[PDB]
Amino acid sequence: YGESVKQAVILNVVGGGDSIADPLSPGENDMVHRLKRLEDEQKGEIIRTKHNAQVIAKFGRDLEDVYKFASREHKQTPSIHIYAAPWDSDSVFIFHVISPHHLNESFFLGFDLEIEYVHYEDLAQHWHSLGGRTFREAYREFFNLASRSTMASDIHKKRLQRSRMSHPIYLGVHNYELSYIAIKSNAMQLVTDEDLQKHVLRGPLHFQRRVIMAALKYGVKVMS
Amino acid sequence: YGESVKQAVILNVVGGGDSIADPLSPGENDMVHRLKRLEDEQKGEIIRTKHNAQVIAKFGRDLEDVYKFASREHKQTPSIHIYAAPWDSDSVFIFHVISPHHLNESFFLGFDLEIEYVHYEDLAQHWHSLGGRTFREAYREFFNLASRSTMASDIHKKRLQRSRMSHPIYLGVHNYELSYIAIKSNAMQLVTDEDLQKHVLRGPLHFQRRVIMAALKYGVKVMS
Amino acid sequence: YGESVKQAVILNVVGGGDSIADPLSPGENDMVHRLKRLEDEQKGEIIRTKHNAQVIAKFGRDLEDVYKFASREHKQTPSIHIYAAPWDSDSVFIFHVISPHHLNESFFLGFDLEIEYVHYEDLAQHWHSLGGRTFREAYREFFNLASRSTMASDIHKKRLQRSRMSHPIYLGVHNYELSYIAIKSNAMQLVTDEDLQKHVLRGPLHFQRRVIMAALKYGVKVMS
């Protein structure tokens, strides 16, 4: 039963009430932006039309009075940068999440949906004296960990290893309305909580990539 | 040649003239709904604008008369519930079609596009004295029949068997404007008529899932 | 570094600034057409509304004068036809590009994204006396060349061979604003220039099929 309501809330986010595009589709991202602009303009046009109706009605009244009178006298946000792996591009991809106001505050979130694996790493740099993997390293590491899975197909492992030594494909940026700290916590919830993870990392690829974004925006509340 | 016109009519349905969303994409379903609302509002705004133009013109005329006058004196529907299999989610999915006005009138339609198999079962309950598989059973049965295909890859069969003992992923509901009896007949046409079936169960996955819905709405008329 | 700007310009085309639909999705093609119509109508409605505001304001002024007056006296384009292979439909597809004003001027462009292969052939007929593969042949040939790739999976080769002897699935027509000669040159640039090709034939399938169209519209300028 518990499963029922989980599915229901998840489904409600990625249906209406959230304009989430597939992170691997810059085209769907454009389309979602275009629908939003159209909605916003249409609201504005409704306002203008009603303004014009009111001005018109007021002039009708004034016209009546002028008739009568004459008649008498007649007589910033965290940026989520998206990269697909050069192999199995639809299933293997990486987020680079950047804090808007710290030079070196960011984290990595890597996904292999073929084996349903997610890896998080903090990339922040912090100096301490009483008074830190690079992005590339995190990328390379991620392919090693994924190729480790016993669940990984022999052929899968081979493409993971080739992606590891190749350049990823940048697909652009998402910007949602939450803090660095919140998205960071969401990302870690995604990796640490096994239940949430099993609910997010499943179903048709297109839907699951949107659900991933929903999980980034809400964490466990993606099933609230 | 006959093939040509078939392709043409099929293509015409899933192009314009039918707002069919991919059943496995709640996001595309939302988008199609949003485009419809925008179209509907835009028609209404066109009407309001023209109303305002007419009222304005009428006031122009009235203003003329007032000028002249003063101048003289100057001197329900079946619900299609959609579930993806937990494995091969993009290719293996199930419809539960529910009659709007009978407590226990529904049917199952299961699809495996990897092997291009479709299975129909009536789930209705009818008592008879002169005066019936459950949904779960139909689900379990479906994976058995599919794993039977000689055409099924060894690995395919294994995931079918795992899906059989796992919980499917609900992706929501479609509601089209036809009767239970008609959609039911369409579903059976889909399974019984080999020609229609070969025309519906092919091509890129996204397109084929939309064509499936078109077939549910029109049956053989999907190629008329 | 050079890679960076390439990715950036590519991404800019298939983001905004170009309404490119996935060639394998007649549904997305319809949707893109619908968004365009809505945008076009909304611009027109904005114009009508402002016209009405101006007419209204002018009538307000006129009304004032009538009040005052009364008060005193008080005392063609190349067509790109799209066909998916009957097997591996999402990855194996063919363009038939037809000149608008020559009976027998067209070319073939075949793609297998599984092995990232593109094949171009001129299908034009030209008679010469001082004073030519068919479409089918080009189709059949294409599957032979693709099944030749050493990179091709054994199973891949088998489906290529079956597609070769079967009928492709027509998915419709795209029409972009360029000449036959230009698109023809673009198509050949795509096949001859190894760099462009490596930049176009990669990433998630949906994105890569859109990038292919972008390459057809711009050639090397797709990375300018």
Residue numbers in the entry:
A (entry chain A), B (entry chain A), C (entry chain A): 65 to 139, 361 to 416, 423 to 515
Question: What does the study report here?
Answer:
Bluetongue virus (BTV) is transmitted by blood-feeding midges (Culicoides sp.), causes haemorrhagic diseases in livestock and is responsible for considerable global economic losses.It is an unenveloped icosahedral virus, belonging to the Orbivirus genus of the family Sedoreoviridae, with a multilayer capsid enclosing a segmented double-stranded RNA (dsRNA) genome. The inner two capsid layers (composed of VP3 and VP7) comprise a core particle which remains intact following infection, whilst the outer layer contains two proteins, VP2 and VP5. VP2 is the attachment protein and protrudes from the virion surface, whilst VP5 is implicated in membrane penetration. Protein VP5 forms part of the outer layer of BTV, with two symmetric trimers of VP5 fitting like pegs into pits on the underlying core.
Here we characterise VP5 at two pHs by crystallography to provide a detailed analysis of the pH dependent structural changes and consider the consequences at the virion level. The low pH form was solved in the native state and refined at 2.2 Å. The low pH conformation at 2.2 Å provides a precise description of this state, presumed to be primed for host membrane engagement. Since the two N-terminal helices are deleted from the construct the crystal structure begins at the H4 helix (secondary structure numbering follows that defined for the high pH conformation), which lies against the body of the subunit, following which the chain turns to run upwards away from the body of the subunit in an extended helix, H5 (residues 90 to 137). Interestingly the electron density for this extended helix is clear, allowing a reliable model to be built, whereas the density in the cryo-EM reconstruction (EMDB 24684) fades quickly away from the main body of the VP5 subunit, despite which the cryo-EM model is similar to the X-ray structure in this region. Likewise the low pH structure confirms the extended helical protrusion that was inferred but poorly resolved in the previous cryo-EM structure. There are some differences between the structures in the virion and in the crystal, for instance in the low pH crystal form the so called dagger domain (residues 410–421) cannot follow the path seen in the virus, due to clashes with symmetry molecule in the crystal. Low pH triggers a major conformational change in VP5 which enables the penetration of the membrane via the extended helical structure. In summary we show that VP5 in isolation undergoes essentially the same changes with pH as seen in the virus and confirm the helical transition to produce spikes radiating from the virus surface. This indicates that VP5 is a pH driven motor during cell entry.
